[PDB]
Each structure stands twice: as C-alpha cells, then as structure tokens.
C-alpha cells in the first residue's frame, strides 16, 4: 500500500512539473538581453573592525545601518559602531561555539546561538547598564544555524535538527514549529512584511513558510547540493540561494520556479553567504576561495569582486540603506566595503 | 700604527674607472639593503595577518638594518673608496657609535629570534602563553637600548683607548679618519657583548632545533613510509652560514689586531666591514623572504596583475 | 559641535575598556588548546571522558599548567558534514573507536570510514587525529576465545602477521595481538594513502580505563604543535 501512495506522490510531482513548464514562457535572460549592463563595480574597503580573536562566523546590521553585531568562535559577541570603528559592547558568551547572530530591529535585544542547541537573548539596554541574558530559548535537538527577530518579542530560529521554530521570548515556548525539511537547515530570510520566510537546507531544497499558519507554502528544488545561504529580493517576490554546488540561484515565489543561475566554470568552490543591495540589482556572494563576487542579478554576469580577505568569507551583509556591505571572515576581521 | 703629523688624503691610488665601479657596487649594496628591509618593514605592518608577536622581531630587525643602510653605510662607502673621511670629526665618533649600536641591535635581534624559535619548538604548548607581546617588546627594548649605552658610553667617553697606550692610540689613528680602535680589554669586551654571546646563543639554540628536526624526520619517515638530508639542514644552513660568514671574519680580525700589533692594511678592513654590511642586507633575505607566508602576502600586495587559483581547482 | 565631542569621548572610553577586557581574554585564550571528542557510536566516550577530568559539553582539564578545552559533541545528529567543519581550528580530534566491535552492524567500518572522511576533508586537512581504540581487552579476549572471525569478516587477514617490530604487553600472545595490531594498519593505511604532511594520526590502542589517557592527549598535543611549528618555519 506504500507504493499506492508513492504513485500518487509521483503523479502530483508530475503535475507540478507540468505546471511549472507551462508557466515558463521565457527565461530571465531573454527578457533582460536588451538592458544596459551595470558595468564594472569597483568598491574598496572603508573600515576594518579588529578586536576578534578567532574566526568570526556571523554578523548582522542594525536597522539604523550604523550599529553592527558580530559573533566569533572565541565566545565573543561584539557590537561595533561601524562609522567610527568603536566597540559599543562586548558580550561574553557561555558557549564558545556561536554559529548565529542577530540584532533586533528595535536595537534593544541581540540574539546568538550555535552548537549549544540554545538561542541566547541579550538585553542591551537594561536599566542597570549591563548586558544580561534575557532568556535562553531551548528545545532544539541540533545546532542553531541562523536566528532572526520578527519583533522585540518573537524570534525565528533554524536548527540543524531539520526543523525551524518560531519562539515567543516572553514565555520561552515555541509558538510554532516547522518540520518539512529532510536535511539540516543552514540559513533564513524574512520577508520585508515578515509574514513569510524561507529556509535553505542540506537536502538541496529551499522552503517558503508562513509564520502564522506554519506549513510550507512552496518548495524550490532547483539546486543539487547543500544550501548554505539565502536572502530575499527587496520586494519580497524572489530570493537567492547559494549552495555547495558553487552556484547561486535566483528563485521566484509567484512563478514557483527557478529564474536564474549565477555560476562560472572557473568556480567550483562552495558559496557561504548571499545578499542583495537596496534595489536588488546586485547579488553579492561570498565563496570559500577567500573572496567574494558581485553579480548583476539580471545579467548573471560578474559585475565585480571583493578580494580583501584571507581565510573565508563566513558572513556577508548589506545595510538597510545600502550605504555599505560588511563581510565577516574566518581571519577574525570584518571588512566594510562600499 | 706609527702616527704622523700631516695626513695624506690623496692616498686614493685608484683609477677613476675602477673607483667608480666600486661606488656602483657599493651603492648596489645600499639599494639592496634599503629595498629589502623596506619591504619587510612595510608589509609586516600593512597586512593584519602578519601581526603575530614573532613578526614584531623581524619588523624590528628590519628597522635596524634599514637605519644602518640609511644613515651609516654611505659614510663608510666614502671612507673605504677614498681612504679619507670628508665629513669632519664630531660626525666621526657619533658615526662609529651608531654603527656599533645598530650592528649589535641586528645581531641581538638574531639571537632573540633564535630564542623565540627555541621556545617555539622545545616548549610548544606553553609557547603562545610565554612569548606574548609584553616579553617580545621587552626583548626589542633591551636589544635597542643596551647596545646604545654600550656604544655611546664607550666611544664618546674614549674608553676604548682607555687602558691602552695613547702613543699607539694616536698612532693607531694613522691620519685618524674613523679607523675604529679597540684596546685589548675593550676589544674582547665588544667581541663578547656584540658577537660571542649572541653567536653562542644562536648556535646552542639552533643545534637543538636541528637535532629535534632530524629526530622528527626520522619518526615521520619510519611511520608513514608504508629533503637535502632534511628541510632543517638547508634552512638552518642558510640562517647560520650567512651569519657566520658575514660576521665572524670581522670580529675575528678585530679582536686579533690589538694583541698582534697588526697594521691590518685598509683593504682587509673595507672588505670585512662590507661583509658585515652584507649581513644586514641578507637578514631579510633569510628571515622573511625565505618563508612562504611572507612571500604569499607580498604577492597578494601585487593583486592588480595576478589572480588566485582558488586552491588550484583541485579535483580527483 | 560639543555634544558630538562628548559622545565621541564617551564611546572612546567604552572602546578603551572593551579593548582592555579583550586583551585580557586574549592572554587567557592563546594559552588554551581546543580539542574534540568524536564518538563513532557507543565506542567508549563514557569512561574515557571521566579520565579527562544539551549540545557541546565543554570540560576544562589542566595538565602540567596547560589549559586544554575538550568538546564532547553530543545530541548532534549523525550527519556531520556541516558541524565537523567548525572544529578545524582545534589542535586534535580525539577519535574513539570500539576495536572489539569488528565482528559485532559494523562499528569498525562505520568508524574506519569516518576516519577516512575526516582525513580527506578540505577543511580538516590541517587537523590531526588522536585515535583511541577502546575495548582492546574485549578484542583480545574474543580472539583468544576463538570468537574472532576476523579471518572471514575482514578476510584480508591471512597475509597479515604480527609486526616483528612489535611491542606486545604481557598476556597478549603473538596471535591475540594480531587483532589489536590489525586495527592499527587500517587507520595507518588510510593515513599513508591520502597523505599531505600537514596532519598526522596518533594511534593509542588501550583499554577502557587507564590513567595514561590524559598523558597521551598531552604528549600528542605536544608533538602536533612541535610539528606545526617546525613546518611553518620551513624547518621540517
């Protein structure tokens, strides 16, 4: 009787593939052929934030585009003032393995997590004047890979136990849990309206979840290996994922299918972080070959490179105003380009 | 050496063509010493990766050699190619004093690099804990200072002449110039402070390192077998042969002069002094250029032409 | 602009304090060696841990004034391709095996292949592996009792002979030690095969309880560091 359901699943997959093929009247390149190229993009470092002891693995910008937060494998969660290079805070972590980092949109709270299964929330502006863990969200059986705030209260975490979760911090219980994936979950991205968010997994598939209802609305299976990074298009109707296939790929949500591929035969290294600019015309990517790239998201041509790191670009992020792009690397440095 | 009244400054018995070639070679030596040390002092400070404490000795042994090339060597270039000072007398003592200071600083930095390597391969677990920035900066300071006092209190205070016959001292002048004169007591004292102690430390510390490397090669070969007799023979041969061949001739001929009343005809003085200076030229060629990491960083400096292979696109 | 200057001086004071604390923490961190306690199933990992004395369990033992970390990665799923990349900065990967589990599924080729996978990983080409082989007593007991089908289960056991340069402790006849030494040329075969000179394997076939078990991790974290230092100086 199991095969009786496998046949129905195969038939439904065939229907989905037929619908996607019917809906692909043309590709992005045929309609972008007659557009002006972005040209060469030369941007050089503007700040180098030093003070970390081990390979920095995460980072996040504040909504004001000035304050920054970075997390390193030495146990330090440092909050920089990127404009002046100053350190506004240095939070000592209980566990030296911190795989994520998140600056709350209001700026009040910060979040970290890693191989300790626990997402620690730090209150930056207690009346006392110091930083103390507001709450340790526990209930994951894997390792936090990326956590992002929806508000000062709620938070969304992705864990290596093949599930995501939406936590209510005021109580510590998982408001909802997302269990659709079949491999690890290695990254996240929240819609500008925050009603949807996508998770990239190690099953070579991205999934789109609705935060309220809590079930995968769509699954995107264009990749062929582990997905290490994911970010939306500023308008929320498309997103881009980087994998160990050594290719970024731009999927769309309303077409429910892959739109474009960004790869080069000379590149076979894995991708570790992707980001867009304030307009979405530049897909920055961070590879394992010590450098980055800047693709014209509509031409798929390499509009530029960012080669100033030594070991690995472990996280990469553009500010909410687009004025800068910070790359935190395994050489224990953040380089703020522009 | 049989002083006189009127010094003959025309003693430059050389043809213009050959003394010009000597100038060309010597200024080549100057340019090499300037450029190599400038590279090893700019690049060790520019890249944030090349900021480990052990690199702040090579970045301070490059400063002494750079200073030696800048404000010392040319004034000996002229003295050697013309046998006549042409820069006065008060610039003489403050020249043969800064020369001693900088030579001793260079050789002391060599000895301290050997000490650092010893604590690096004979106490490895407690290496980064004990070779912290504080101790290494203390080493820099002592190396920079102690020679400074030992030179400016031994030359200015005419203490090298002290304890020796003044007739032989004014005689040892031989028209004066800046022929450095070392009495027996001062000669052996400088031989010990500047060369023998740093040299003995370097030898007694690199013998152990070479023995450890040979033992480690034996173990690795025996284990995982299913080098010019080593990679420790070639590199340590460079590191110690350059130092010996460049420095030992001068000091052996300098402490051996006072006892034997040797006139040391000036050609030997010039050639041995210039071996001494070749040591400062070569220090960066064997302590910073010889090692890959530095070469790779320098290549990354010139990134406007070369493109990395991204691990050479390795594939089975 | 005067309030701007006040805010700038306040931020610089905060930066000075933060940098002082970070310098102290660096003086404490450079003198601390990390480790990892990979357990290939129920192979020791419960008694061996107590001689080095809910995710990463971090213990902090101190041998001869040196500060060793140690990270018993537990509760992590049995899918290591992603979190085994975060332990590339450790000085060693203590790999515990059940050397008596050869003929018991297979816990000796799901751990003998895990070593191969770790060895050839592009991020762990630099991380050495200290290799404990627990239950050697059980292995030898089974071999002496005739339970050893390592001649059909690992049928490449006929051409094998006890290395004439052996060091067999008393009670292990030449034939019984054939097992404990048989699971030393397999991991050593993998190490010899792949090969780069950058990372090394240290086998320590011992029983499930001994005080010579922190003195082995120490004595090999000393040699890993010696070799790493003799290699970065182009010295060997």
């Amino acid at each position, epitope marked *: 009787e199991l095969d009786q359901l496998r046949q129905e699943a195969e038939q439904l997959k065939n229907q989905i593939r037929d619908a996607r093929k019917a809906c692909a009247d043309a590709t992005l390149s045929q309609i972008t052929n007659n557009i002006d190229p972005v040209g060469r993009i030369q941007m050089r470092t503007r700040r180098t934030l030093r003070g970390h002891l081990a390979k920095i693995y995460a980072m996040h910008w504040g909504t004001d585009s000035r304050l920054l937060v970075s997390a390193s494998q030495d146990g330090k969660l440092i909050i920089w003032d990127s404009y002046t290079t100053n350190k506004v805070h240095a939070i000592p972590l209980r566990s030296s393995w911190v795989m994520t980092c998140a600056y709350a949109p209001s700026g009040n709270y910060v979040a970290c997590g890693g191989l300790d299964n626990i997402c620690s929330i730090y209150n930056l502006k207690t009346r006392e004047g110091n930083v103390r863990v507001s709450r340790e969200l526990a209930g994951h059986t894997g390792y936090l890979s990326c956590c992002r705030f929806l508000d000062d209260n709620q938070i969304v975490t992705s864990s290596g136990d093949t599930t995501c979760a939406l936590w209510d911090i005021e109580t510590g219980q998982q408001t909802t849990t997302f269990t659709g994936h079949t491999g690890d979950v290695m990254s996240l991205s929240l819609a500008p309206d925050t009603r949807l968010f996508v998770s990239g997994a190690c099953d070579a598939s991205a999934k789109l979840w609705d935060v309220r209802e809590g079930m995968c609305r769509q699954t995107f299976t264009g990749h062929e290996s*582990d997905i290490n990074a994911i970010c939306f298009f500023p308008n929320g109707n498309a997103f881009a994922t980087g994998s160990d296939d050594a290719t970024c790929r731009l999927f769309d949500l309303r077409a429910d299918q892959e739109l474009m591929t960004y790869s080069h035969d000379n590149i076979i290294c894995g991708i570790t972080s992707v980001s867009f600019s304030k307009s979405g015309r530049l897909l920055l990517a961070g590879y394992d070959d010590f450098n980055c790239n800047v693709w014209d998201a509509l031409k798929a041509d390499r509009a530029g490179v960012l080669a100033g790191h030594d070991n690995r670009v472990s996280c990469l992020g553009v500010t909410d105003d687009g004025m800068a792009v910070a790359t935190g690397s395994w050489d224990s440095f953040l380089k703020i380009w522009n | 050496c049989h002083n006189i009244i009127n010094i003959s400054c025309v003693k430059n018995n050389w043809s213009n063509d050959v003394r010009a070639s000597l100038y060309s070679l010597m200024v080549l030596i100057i340019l090499t010493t300037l450029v190599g040390n400038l590279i090893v002092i700019v690049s060790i400070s520019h890249f944030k990766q090349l900021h480990t404490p052990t690199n702040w000795l090579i970045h301070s042994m490059a400063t002494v050699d750079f200073l030696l090339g800048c404000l010392v060597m040319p004034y000996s270039m002229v003295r050697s190619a013309e046998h006549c000072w042409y820069f006065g007398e008060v610039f003489c003592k403050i020249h043969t004093s800064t020369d001693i200071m900088l030579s001793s600083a260079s050789i002391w930095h060599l000895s301290f690099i050997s000490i650092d390597r010893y604590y690096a391969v004979c106490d490895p677990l407690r290496y980064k804990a004990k070779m912290n920035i504080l101790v290494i900066c203390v080493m820099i300071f002592i190396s920079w200072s102690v020679p400074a006092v030992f030179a400016f209190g031994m030359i200015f205070l005419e203490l090298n002449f002290k304890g020796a016959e003044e007739i032989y001292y004014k005689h040892v002048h031989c028209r004066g110039g800046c022929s450095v004169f070392f009495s027996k007591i001062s000669g052996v004292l400088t031989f010990m402070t500047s060369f023998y102690i740093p040299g003995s430390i370097m030898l007694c510390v690199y013998y152990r390192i070479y023995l450890i490397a040979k033992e480690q090669a034996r173990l690795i070969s025996d284990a995982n077998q299913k080098s010019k007799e080593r990679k420790a023979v070639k590199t340590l041969g460079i590191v110690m042969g350059v130092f010996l061949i460049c420095w030992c001739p001068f000091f052996i001929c300098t402490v051996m002069d006072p006892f034997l009343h040797y006139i040391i005809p000036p050609t030997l003085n010039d050639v041995l002094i210039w071996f001494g200076y070749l040591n400062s030229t070569f220090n960066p060629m064997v302590y910073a250029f010889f090692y890959p990491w530095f070469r790779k960083a320098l290549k990354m400096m010139l990134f406007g032409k070369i493109f990395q292979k991204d691990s050479s696109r390795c594939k089975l | 602009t005067e309030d701007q200057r006040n805010e700038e001086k306040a931020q610089r004071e905060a930066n000075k304090k933060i940098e002082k604390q970070l310098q102290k923490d660096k003086q404490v961190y450079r003198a601390t060696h990390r480790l990892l306690l990979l357990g290939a199933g129920e192979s020791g990992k419960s008694t061996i841990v107590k001689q080095m004395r809910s995710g990463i369990f971090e213990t902090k033992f101190q041998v001869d004034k040196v500060n060793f970390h140690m990270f018993d990665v537990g509760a992590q799923r049995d899918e290591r391709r992603k979190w085994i990349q975060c332990f590339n900065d450790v000085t060693a990967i203590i790999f515990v095996v059940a050397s008596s589990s050869y003929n018991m599924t*297979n816990r000796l080729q*799901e751990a003998l292949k895990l070593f191969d996978s770790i*060895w050839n990983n592009k991020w762990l080409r630099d991380t050495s592996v200290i290799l404990f082989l627990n239950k050697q007593d059980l292995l030898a007991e089974k071999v002496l009792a005739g339970k050893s089908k390592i001649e059909d289960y690992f049928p*490449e056991f006929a051409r094998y002979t006890t290395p004439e340069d052996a060091t067999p402790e008393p009670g292990e006849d030449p034939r019984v030690t054939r097992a404990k030494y048989f699971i030393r040329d397999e991991f050593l075969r993998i190490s010899t095969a792949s090969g780069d000179g950058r990372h090394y394997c240290y086998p320590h076939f011992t029983c499930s309880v001994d005080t010579e078990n922190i003195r082995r991790v120490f004595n090999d974290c000393r040699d890993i560091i010696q070799r790493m230092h003799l290699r970065q100086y182009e010295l060997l």
Partner: nanobody
Amino acid sequence: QVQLQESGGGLVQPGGSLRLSCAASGFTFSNYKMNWVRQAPGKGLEWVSDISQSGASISYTGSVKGRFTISRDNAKNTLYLQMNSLKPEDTAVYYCARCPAPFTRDCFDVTSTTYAYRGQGTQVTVSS
C-alpha cells in the same frame, strides 16, 4: 531535483548472480563519488562499496571484495554493482548514495539514517 532510482533485486539462490543499476538524475553525475550502502534486516546501514568521480578509485567493504564488482557509466548517468556468488547474509535493502559535495574525496554521511541524496533502494533476498 536529486533523484536516484535503483533496479535489480529479488530472490537469488545462494551462489547466484545479480546486478544493481542506479539511475541518477537531477545533478551532474560525473562530479560526485558514488557509494553503495546496505541495510540488512534489523541491522543498521552498512557501507558496501564506493567509486570515485572517474571510476579509477574503488573500494569495498571487508566481506565483499573479490565478490562484488562496482562500476559507473558517466555517459548514461548510471552506477552498477555486480553481485556475484551471493551468500545468505548478503540479503538486505541496497541503497544508492552520492557524497554530499562535488570534487571531494570525503563522503561523510552516506551511511547516516536520514541522508537526503540516497535512493529508496532495492530488496535482495538470498535463500532457496
């Protein structure tokens, strides 16, 4: 979409011969080292064989070498395991697996319980 489908299986008297074919679609076959693993009835997954990108490097589990022959055809995007002289203990569910990443000699989790790039496998029964 990564999709590995196995064929060949069923009853085979001891000493008989069988052939397992793995058809791989949804990725570039010639870039990934391909493994065959197995799960015996009641036991856990057990690595059986591997084959590297080009087919030059091969390796078997202990109780299999000289008895199974593994090969791959990159032109047809297919993997093959010739099971010769079967024994009763060889009955199991055979799974076709691919290493997680391209251009790597490491193949970490093919034996894991919840691998994503592994096929549904085929049953091999060995008894009269």
